[PDB]
DNA sequence: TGAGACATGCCCAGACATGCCCGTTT
DNA sequence: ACGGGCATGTCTGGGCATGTCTCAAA
């Protein structure tokens, strides 16, 4: 069973937020919206922000977890290299083969599902500080996304979501998450194969649309794109 | 006896849906808008959505079951090559005989009518979560649609039902399968050939686009509306 | 263990001989010197000669054995495909796994060797009918060289050997098979690659050689490709 | 305890042998003359050659054992990475985590020293069969050699030894190795760093040669004859 | 540390490979 | 009865991806 990856902000509108990298500990994590992917160094701290509407009732919940980007992938579950399961490199309250961990937290707490056999953690969910209208949460990836015998490599993507005491759904968001060696540079890079998806494909193609109600459908369609594009 | 690809939705909504993606030399799976074919990969992963109006109750189950969809052998069963069938991989539960499985789902059952030795797959249904309007099952193939001694070219047609708690039926539809080694290649090729094969008569409306598979999954979203005018 | 294919023309000055290729069942079944290759057809009879100086004792026979050319596959048994091993494809005297079968002689043996666990067939040797000075054996191959569970497109080898009653090597010989389904195609396409392998490639380079007595060790050496070479 | 790498010949003029393939990136495994080092994929085959001047004693045996080379890792035991240690190879007959393994052998044995926990593999020695003038014997090195968790990138040596009976050592000789995924490549640098860091002192003569694969040759015949002068 | 410059495992668009199915000549 | 397109699985050199080492400048 794949978990679902819907957005989805429920009725206490439930959404993520990330800060800019370029100061101190960013180049060892940096966020880029145009992809709305996270890139960052093994181990190293990601600071997350929670935003919401209302105010989440008693009990309430924020879990973590990784599905695979990539469909011929998603009903693996995302595990840890065998490499690095077997290193003191815990703090003891996580388990060695949770990919995801929280930092800095004693009340967080880790699931190895029975069933879905999926891995996940979760904390209480607790009020903005007063004065910022957000609740930051630090997460540490434990594998680089790209060890073998783990995600080898395969994209994979984090689905934060907001569930009540009883654990129903409640709100749901999701970021892509890349573990590396430079971010910095891997962030250019894939940056640059899109600022080249876009200029380095111009030609044009025509299409055949019988309906005079079904033209006005494409062309509202079409006339759509061609407002938000040469912007 | 044999079984019918009568399109038989069901008194609830048991249908189809597929997800839109490129063709290009280097994916495992893309659908055929048309042809309501498949082209993925041996052993990959197939992506089948089942959406519906009304919930079926407590009980109802999913079947897979294949089908030559050529007249003159679709009335014989669907089976491995001796090669493959020698062979056991990171499943051990789920026989070898079998052509289709199903990813993840322990909950999963593979059969052979005592009365037809026809291969058959049954896995539990499960409703949308919160937010969500749908299901996705992943099926793996496990067997080229052209390996010697089997299938051997021979086209298919999965047969997936919704049969209730019993076994009887309450649901039905299909879609063509084509394991083959390029998915995108006998794609955009067993394409073509319906896009030159006949000249017809209409008039349609001018409308050109812009992008490469921008535009390749436009004139792509093209298909799917005349349809409804013929059968 | 990967059984010798060392040439060895022993007391008995043994060595193999072939015919053209280009009259009755020619074409489907060619043997090329310059590649010492033979292309044949699945199934189809191929003709071999024997020739010996002198005459083999009381006792002798000929063995025929396949090795995998390359390297990384000389260990693996040659095995015949899983879809042929499964067909009444067979005279009855020789077991349905053995690739290669003798034709005419019912005196033929097969083996299928219990410690190298290798195939392997023998014939009592015969004296050359008088006339000629040789004798003709007859060979035919039962899977395609690209039949997958089998050989699997990887080149084989044949290996004749003259072994005395007890076993003991006498003298061997070998040369390079190719089954398939299209003979003279494939013979002329290889001579082809070949014939584009020495003329396609003319570049000179040259080499710095330490030591006077050694330069005219490479010089006699290189002076002798220049001979056979242009010729 | 750290085993000795000293050349020993003894009184049967014990010495390795190995073939002469090419660069192509193609090439599963290739040796070098020049570095006397082997370069083979993960678990392909390595063809050794084994040649002796006198016929040794009823129950001589060949071991084969790695030992990194660089003096500050030469007391850790080689052994296999975690990843490909999880993993039971179709060679039940040998354990999991020994780095070099033989094929087609079952009278070969594995070894796990309990005083210096050193792995290694033996094999009964097998005179040469007729016609022939040595002895090859069949490995395959069980993982890249830059496993993380495992060699880590570290150079090994290989230490072939010829022990009899009662194991007293009877000769020795050893090569380096590579385990990548392009010994053609990898080679063709390593060996050009050589073919550059070096100046040599001397009068060289020039010989002009025909045909990069020919020229190929005589450099590597070359260089062999360039170590027979060094150490 | 920040940016090259490696090192070394892997993708891949574009050929090649190889069994066949016509159709038509020596 | 041997040259020709054809449906399909697959190889491959040129390039790309991704961790890590190395030297000179805030
Ligand atoms: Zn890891
Ligand atoms: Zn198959
Ligand atoms: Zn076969
Ligand atoms: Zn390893």
Redesign the pocket.
């Known amino acids: 069973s794949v978990p679902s990856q819907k957005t989805y902000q429920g009725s206490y509108g439930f959404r993520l937020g990330f800060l800019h990298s370029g100061t101190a500990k960013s ?1 060892t994590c940096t966020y880029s919206p145009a992809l709305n992917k996270m890139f960052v160094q093994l181990a190293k701290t990601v600071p997350v922000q929670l935003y919401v509407d209302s105010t989440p009732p008693p009990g309430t919940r924020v879990r973590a977890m990784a599905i695979y980007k990539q469909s011929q992938h998603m009903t693996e579950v995302v595990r840890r290299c065998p490499h690095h399961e077997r290193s003191s490199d815990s703090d003891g309250l996580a388990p060695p083969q949770h990919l995801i961990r929280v930092e800095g937290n004693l009340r967080a707490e880790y699931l190895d599902d029975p069933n879905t056999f999926r891995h996940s953690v979760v904390v209480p969910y607790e009020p903005p500080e007063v004065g910022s209208d957000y609740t930051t949460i630090y997460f540490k990836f434990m594998c ?3 060890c ?1 015998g783990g995600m080898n ?1 395969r994209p994979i993507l984090v689905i934060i979501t907001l569930e009540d005491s009883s654990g129903n759904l409640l709100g749901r968001d999701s970021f892509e998450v890349r ?4 971010p ?1 540079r ?1 962030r250019r ?1 894939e940056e640059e ?1 899109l600022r080249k998806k876009k200029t380095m494909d111009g030609e044009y193609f025509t299409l055949q649309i019988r309906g005079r109600e079904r033209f006005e459908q494409f062309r509202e369609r079409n006339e759509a794109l061609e407002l938000k594009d040469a912007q």
Not at 179 to 182: D, K, L, Y
Request: aromatic letters at 0%; one cysteine or more; proline letters at 0%.
């Open positions: 180049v680089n996304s790209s073998m490599r573990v590396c060696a430079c910095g891997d890079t194969n």
